[PDB]
Amino acid sequence: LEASRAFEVSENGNLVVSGKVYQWDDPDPRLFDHPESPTPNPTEPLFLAQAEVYKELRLRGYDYGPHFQGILEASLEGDSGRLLWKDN
Amino acid sequence: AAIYNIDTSSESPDHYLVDHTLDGRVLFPATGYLSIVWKTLARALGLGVEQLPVVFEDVVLHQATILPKTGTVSLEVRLLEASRAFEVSENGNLVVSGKVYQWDDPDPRLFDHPESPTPNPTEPLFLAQAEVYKELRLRGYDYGPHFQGILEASLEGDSGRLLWKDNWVSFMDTMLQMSILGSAKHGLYLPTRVTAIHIDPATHRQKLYTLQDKAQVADVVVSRWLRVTVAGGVHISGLHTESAPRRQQEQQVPILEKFCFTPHTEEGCLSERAALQEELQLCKGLVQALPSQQELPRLLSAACRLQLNGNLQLELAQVLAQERPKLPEDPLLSGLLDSPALKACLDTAVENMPSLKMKVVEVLAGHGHLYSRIPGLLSPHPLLQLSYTATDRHPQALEAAQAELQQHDVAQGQWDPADPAPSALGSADLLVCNCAVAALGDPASALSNMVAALREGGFLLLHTLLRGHPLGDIVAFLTSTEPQYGQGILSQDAWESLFSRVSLRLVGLKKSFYGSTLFLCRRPTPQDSPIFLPVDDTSFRWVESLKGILADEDSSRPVWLKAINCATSGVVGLVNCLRREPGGNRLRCVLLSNLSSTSHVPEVDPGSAELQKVLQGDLVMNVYRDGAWGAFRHFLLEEDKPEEPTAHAFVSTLTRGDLSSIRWVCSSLRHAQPTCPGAQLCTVYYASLNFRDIMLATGKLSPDAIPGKWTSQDSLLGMEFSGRDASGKRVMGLVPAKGLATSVLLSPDFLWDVPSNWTLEEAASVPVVYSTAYYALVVRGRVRPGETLLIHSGSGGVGQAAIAIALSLGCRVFTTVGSAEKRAYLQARFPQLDSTSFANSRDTSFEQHVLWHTGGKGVDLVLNSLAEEKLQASVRCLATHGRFLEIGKFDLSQNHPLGMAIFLKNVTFHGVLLDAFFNESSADWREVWALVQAGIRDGVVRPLKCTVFHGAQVEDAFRYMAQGKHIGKVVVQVLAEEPEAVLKGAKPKLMSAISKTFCPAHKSYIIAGGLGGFGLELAQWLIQRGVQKLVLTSRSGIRTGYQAKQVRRWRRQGVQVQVSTSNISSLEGARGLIAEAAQLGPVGGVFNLAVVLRDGLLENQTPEFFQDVCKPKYSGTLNLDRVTREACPELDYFVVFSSVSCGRGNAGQSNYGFANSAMERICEKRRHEGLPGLAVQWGAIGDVSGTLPQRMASCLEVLDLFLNQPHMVLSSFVLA
Amino acid sequence: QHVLWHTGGKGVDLVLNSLAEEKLQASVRCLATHGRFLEIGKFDLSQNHPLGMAIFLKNVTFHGVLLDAFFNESSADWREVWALVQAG
C-alpha cells in the first residue's frame, strides 16, 4: 500500500507478516555507531569461538546449518561479536 | 488496484454528484468511497453488489476530494483480503482507510429500530422536506435535488422518512444528513471516522415500503444515546464528525448605501475638508501682491521663480510638468468631482430618463478626464446599461491611456465644441464638460453647439470655476497664453445669462466654498397640458383615478402626483415603481414633507410660483423639506468600521485565520446583565497568551473544539488574567475563555489573591501552567518523593511548572529542550539540574539518553506534550508501574493507534484535560485550587519569565508567540498597575473599540411578523446577542414544523419566547402588544417585519389591495410609533425593514413601494425628534431587479453594522 | 447498548474488563468522561492489539492491572492490599 506505506505477506490467503515499509529518504550513517557497553570488560582474555556459540545454540534448540552459522565469535556476555558477510 | 473515474458531465451516470455541494464547492460524498469499495470487494469475491452483505469497520477519512467542474478524478482502491483492510488513494495520496469484509451471517434483528427515549407524544407537527433542507442550507449544506432524500423528520430529528431511488450513495448520505439535523452545534460538520457500518441488501429490500404514491420510502431512526443510525438495510454506528473550516472565497460583497435627502442647490460643499482650505490658503499666499507637491502650488512657485512679476508668456508656457495634463490632479480643481455632489447630479441625471438605458457623451475628455470617474459612479445601478463616448479636440489628445478606455465601455470621438456634433453622436441625454480644467472654445458657441447636439429633455453637466472668486482670479492671472481657457471663466450671473440665452434651464447647482461649482441644466421639452392628481386621500380611492388616467395610451400629457396633507405619504416609492410599468414615463411627483412642525408650508396651487418653477424644472422626483426643494439620493456608505469609547472590550480576529485582523471589539459585559451571586466582574490588567490562543488566531483550531456552549460569532481567546476584583483587591484568575479582554466575568472559585511580594505582571503567568502541572502530577499522576520524571519541553511554561513541582519533592528529573539557549536558561533557573538532565526535544534522541542514564529501567512518570513518532518514543521510556501523562492533544484528536502491549508492564495511561473543570466536576477542582494555594504559600510556585506587550500591539504579541523562539510566558499588558495595594477606583479606562450590538437581559423585544422566515432568523440572531425576553407577532400563530422547532428550542434555553398574534394594524392591538411586552420587562426594541404582498400592474390592482398591503407596513408602523412614543421610555431600537423596490422601483409592486416609502418617512421623522429609528432596504434574501439573493449570514452581518450607524435609512444588496 | 441505554447514554465511571478482542473495544466504548478502565485480562495486551487514543480526549485513565507483579517479593504496596483484604 504505497499510499499507506504498509506491506502484507500472505500464504494461501492467510496473513503471515504485516507492518510498514518505505524508502529511507535521508540515511544518516551516524545511526550505525556502536553504543558503548555499560561494562568496560578491559582484559577480555576469553571469548566464544564459532564452535562454542553454536554448540550452546544447539543445546538451546537451534540447529542452524553451515550457511546460517555466521557468528565468527562473541564475548562471554553476548554484548559484542564479529559477524560474517557472504553477500546474503 | 481497481480504478474509478468520477465525471460530472450530464451524459455520465455520475452526474448526480453535482448536487452534493458543500460550502459552495462540490465534494465527493463520504458514502461514495464506501460505494466504490463495496463494488471492488464484490468484484474480488465474484458476487454482485446486491448479493454481498458487507461490513465496514474503523473507516477513517484523511482528506476530501474536490470534483472539478471540468475534467475527471481517478480513485484507486486496494484490498488486503488476508488483513480484511482496504485503501482509497487519489493520485498517490491516501484518502480513506479501514476494514471491509463480507458479512458471513446477516442478522435481521440488528436493523430493528432502537427503543425510543421519548414517550411518543404524537405531536401533530413534523419537519417537512422543504423545511428540513431550508435548515440545512442555513447551516451550510447546499444539497441539490438528487441528494434531497428526506421527506419528513421529527422536530427532534430522531426519526423520519427517507426516499429510495436505487442509489446507495444518496441513501447513505441522506442517513448522514438525518444524523446532523438534530445536532445543536451550529456550523458545517463532515464525517471523519465511522466505527462500523452494516449493509444487508436483502433486509433492505424487505424494509422498503411504497407510499400511496409510487415513491419508495424507508423509515429511519437516530439514537444519540446508543449512537446508531438505522434505516432499511443499513446500520451506521459510531459516526464522528469534525467541524469544517466553513470558509468560502469570492463571497458576496453587498453594496451598502445611505438614503438621505439632498437639496437641489447647495453651497459650501467642501467646507469640511481641511486639505482644500489649506491649499487655497497656500495659493492665495503665493499670489499676494500679484512649497508643496500639488500642481497649482508648484506652478505658482515656478511662476514666482521664473520672474517675480511680469513673467514672459513663452517662458512659463513651456515648463516641465506644466504643459502636462496632470494639472487637474490638484485637489481644488477636483474638489467637487470627488465630493458626493457629483454623485447626486449623476443620480438626478439617470433619473428622469425615459428608459433605463442612458446615452452620455463627454466633450474635451482628453483634458477633463471625467471618463475615469463617471463609469465608476453609475456601476451600483443594477439594470442601467450605459452608452458612453469620449470626445476630444484632436485624436492625438487623449491618444494615451487607451487601455483605460478599453476596460470601460467608452469610445473615442472628435468634436470641437464650436463645430457641430457628428451624426454618430447625434442626440444625447447627458453631456459633461469639465470646463474647469479643459478650455472650451467660447461659452456661447460651445453651449449652443452642445444644446443642438443634446436630446430633448437631456441634461447638461458643467463643472467650471466662477469669475469674481479668489481661485477664479488666480487662474485668470495664470495661463493667460490660453485664450480659450480665459473665455471659459465667468461670473455666476454671466453663466445664468448664457443659459437663459439658450433654451437650457438650471435645475441643479452645487457650489463649493471657494468658487468652484457644478452646474446642471436640461433642455426643456415641448410643453403640453398637465394633469394634477392629488394622492393624499385615504382609502386609496385616487388609485382608481390613476388607473383611469393612464388607461389612454395615446395620450402623452404629463401626470403629476400631488401629496401635501400628509408628510408620511410614500408617493416617492409609488412613482419609482410605476415608472417601470407601461405609461409610467408621464408620471411626476411633488411631495411636501417638511420634517419640522414650525416649517413653512409653501402653496402648491397652479397659480403658485413654486408650482410653476417645479413645472419648468420638470423633474420626476420633487420633494420639499424645510424650505428646500430636493430629492432623496443614494450615497455610498463609508467603509470604516465605527468605533466608540468603552470600558468593556475584548480582542478578536475579525477574519478567521488572519493575524492582521486582530482588533479590539466592544464586549457584552458593558451591560453587566449576567451579574449574580456565584459570579463577579474583575478588571483585567495583564492577560497571558497561550498555545491555544495562537492556534485559534492562526485558524488551525476551530472554536467548536473549545468545550462549552459558545456563540458562533464570539471570541474564545485568553484563559489567564491578572487584575483587581470589584473590591479593588489584587487577584489572578483562570477562565475557560474570553480572558483576553478589558473585563472578565468570573466565578470566585477560580480566583487567587496575589501575594504582596509579587507584581500583577508576574501573577499573570502562574494560573494556567501551575494549575495544569499540579493537576497532572499530583492528582492524576500521584507523584511521590524520590521518583524519576521525564518532562518534555522544559522551556515551556508547563514544563517549567512541572520541573519546579518535581524538584520540590526531590524527584530526579529528565527534560528535553529545543536549543542550547533554552538549556542554559533552564540550567540557570534550576541549579539542581545537572548536565545529564537534558536531551534534544526535536528528535527521538532523548529516548536513548533516558534509558542509558536510568540503567535501562525507564522512568516513573512521563509528562508528554509531543506528537506522533515522538509520542511513541516517550511511551517506551516508561518503567514498571509507570504513569504516562498526556497533556498534548494531537494524537488524541487524530485517534492514532496505541499498542496495548505496554500495559503488560503494569503502567497506567492518563488523558489529562484541564478544561473539563470549567464545565463539570467543579467540586473536584477545588483540590487543585488548594494545591496551587499551598504551592504559592510555600514558595514552590514561582512566576515565569514575562514578555510584556502593550494593549495597542496585541498583533505584535501574537506574531512573537507564533515564532517558537519565545521563552517563558507572553503577557499582553492592558492597564498599568497602580502603586497601591487596594484601590476602589478599579474601573478600566476607556478604549476606542469596534462597536457591536448587544442587548441587556432585563428588557423585552418585539418582532412584528416575527414567525416569518426573516422574522425567525432575526430572532435567532438577537438571542445570540443576549436577549432573554422576546415577543413574536403572527396573524395565524404557529402553524409549521420549523416554527415550532425553533420556538421550542429557544424556550429550552431559558428564553421567554411569547407568541402574541395581536395585529399592529389597529392602535388597540399595538397597545395590547406593547403592554404584553411590558409584562416580561421594559421594552428594549421593536422590529416591524410584517408584510402582505398583492402584486400586479396598476391596471389590475384595486384600492382594497393597497389597503391590505399598507395595513401591516404603513398603518402598523404608525401605530407602533405612536404607542412607543407614549409608553416606551427605555426603547433602544425602532427598526423597520423595507425593500430596494422603494428606491429603485419594480414593475407591479407599486403598493409595496408606497408602503415601504411611508415606513421610511415615519422613521426619518422619528430620528429628527431624537428618538430611535431605522429603515433598512434589502435587495433579496436567499436562504429563507438585477440583484442577487443575499445570504442570511451576510444579511445579519450587514444589519449588525447599520444598528451602529447615525443615519436614518440604509440599503444593502448584491449586484448581478 | 444495554449500558448506554440504562445510563442515559452517559456511560460507566469504572470498568473491570476481563474479556478480549472485540468485546474489549465495546467495553471501552462504555466509558464516561473521567472514566477509568481496569484491564485485568492479558490476551489483548500480549498480542499488542491497537488501541485508539481518541478515547483519552474524554478525561480518562487506562490501567494495566497485574496482581502478579507483587508475588515475587513482599513490597510496601502489597501490604496495603493485604490490609484491605483483612479489613474486608
Ligand SMILES: NC(=O)C1=CN([C@@H]2O[C@H](COP(=O)(O)OP(=O)(O)OC[C@H]3O[C@@H](n4cnc5c(N)ncnc54)[C@H](OP(=O)(O)O)[C@@H]3O)[C@@H](O)[C@H]2O)C=CC1
Ligand atoms: N491539559 C490541558 O488541557 C492543558 C494543556 N496545555 C497545552 O499544552 C501545550 C504546552 O503548553 P506550553 O508549554 O505553555 O506551550 P508553549 O507554546 O509555551 O510551548 C513551548 C514549547 O513547545 C515547543 N514549541 C513551541 N513552538 C514551537 C515551534 N514553532 N516548533 C516546534 N516546537 C515548538 C518547544 O518545545 P521544545 O523546547 O522541546 O522544542 C517549546 O519550548 C499547549 O498547547 C497548551 O495549550 C496547557 C495547559 C492546559
Ligand SMILES: NC(=O)C1=CN([C@@H]2O[C@H](COP(=O)(O)OP(=O)(O)OC[C@H]3O[C@@H](n4cnc5c(N)ncnc54)[C@H](OP(=O)(O)O)[C@@H]3O)[C@@H](O)[C@H]2O)C=CC1
Ligand atoms: N426577500 C425577502 O424576504 C425580503 C423581505 N423584506 C421584508 O422583510 C420582512 C420579512 O419578510 P419575510 O419574513 O421574508 O416574509 P414573510 O412572508 O414570512 O412575512 C410575513 C410574516 O409576517 C406576518 N404578518 C403579515 N402581516 C402581518 C400583520 N399585519 N401583523 C402581524 N403579522 C403580520 C405573517 O403572518 P400572517 O400571514 O399570519 O399575517 C408572516 O409570518 C417583511 O416586512 C418583508 O417585506 C423585504 C425585502 C426582501
